[PDB]
Design an enzyme around this catalytic site. Structure first.
Site, PDB file in Angstrom:
ATOM      1  N   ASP A   1       5.858  31.535  13.077  1.00 42.47           N
ATOM      2  CA  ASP A   1       6.559  30.587  13.936  1.00 42.47           C
ATOM      3  C   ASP A   1       8.063  30.447  13.691  1.00 42.47           C
ATOM      4  O   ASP A   1       8.470  29.782  12.749  1.00 42.47           O
ATOM      5  CB  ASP A   1       5.852  29.232  13.733  1.00 42.47           C
ATOM      6  CG  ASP A   1       6.214  28.191  14.764  1.00 42.47           C
ATOM      7  OD1 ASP A   1       7.104  28.392  15.611  1.00 42.47           O
ATOM      8  OD2 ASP A   1       5.579  27.128  14.703  1.00 42.47           O
ATOM      9  N   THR A   2       8.890  30.998  14.575  1.00 38.33           N
ATOM     10  CA  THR A   2      10.334  30.877  14.398  1.00 38.33           C
ATOM     11  C   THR A   2      10.805  29.490  14.821  1.00 38.33           C
ATOM     12  O   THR A   2      11.935  29.090  14.548  1.00 38.33           O
ATOM     13  CB  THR A   2      11.117  31.946  15.192  1.00 38.33           C
ATOM     14  OG1 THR A   2      10.928  31.744  16.596  1.00 38.33           O
ATOM     15  CG2 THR A   2      10.647  33.348  14.818  1.00 38.33           C
ATOM     16  N   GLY A   3       9.932  28.760  15.503  1.00 36.12           N
ATOM     17  CA  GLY A   3      10.280  27.427  15.945  1.00 36.12           C
ATOM     18  C   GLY A   3      10.036  26.406  14.850  1.00 36.12           C
ATOM     19  O   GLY A   3      10.290  25.218  15.035  1.00 36.12           O
TER      20      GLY A   3
END
Lengths: 99, 99
Positions: free
Chosen positions: A25-27
């Site tokens: 997850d880059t978020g």
């Protein structure tokens, strides 16, 4: 490797000898794992998401194998819908977004 | 371009003729924009993640420009804490995860 995003970027991680599935997850600023037992002391931490805030337990210097790469860092344990590998560990395995 | 994950992967986007900032979120199935007006029909939807669910308005076939890359897809409008670009649009611009 290269991971397209047509489907959820789920990978196998190893934390404490037990395999689990986690979402790259880059978020996510941090790495949050579902309720499990981790060694050492923990500190309180509040994290925000799409639906609101949740309380989590913070464990420092935890060894976790992500897709064959070994990372050692902060892992948060709490009521998360799915296990997520946040930027704190994505940087350790040298992960970047490209287009 | 290649975006490192040392800090939040925020980019400038253009939706509905408005310039905004959004997070490149591989952990998101959908693209969720903070409360705004979009033309066309919409239907209610419930989306969840950390902290629970939130009700949003689903608009289909909405054009968005992300880093000079035009794309089209479903855009959800609602009480999200931050604008997020999910996998449904991330794929369209040719974005992948690399390590």
């Amino acid at each position: 490797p290269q991971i397209t995003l047509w489907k959820r970027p789920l990978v196998t991680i190893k934390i404490g000898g037990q395999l689990k599935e986690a979402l790259l997850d880059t978020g996510a600023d941090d790495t949050v794992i579902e309720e499990m037992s981790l060694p050492g002391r923990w500190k309180p931490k509040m994290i925000g998401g799409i639906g609101g805030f949740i309380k989590v337990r913070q464990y420092d210097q935890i060894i976790i194998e992500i897709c064959g790469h070994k990372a050692i860092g902060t892992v948060l344990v709490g009521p998360t819908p799915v296990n997520i590998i946040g930027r704190n560990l994505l940087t350790q395995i040298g992960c970047t977004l490209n287009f």
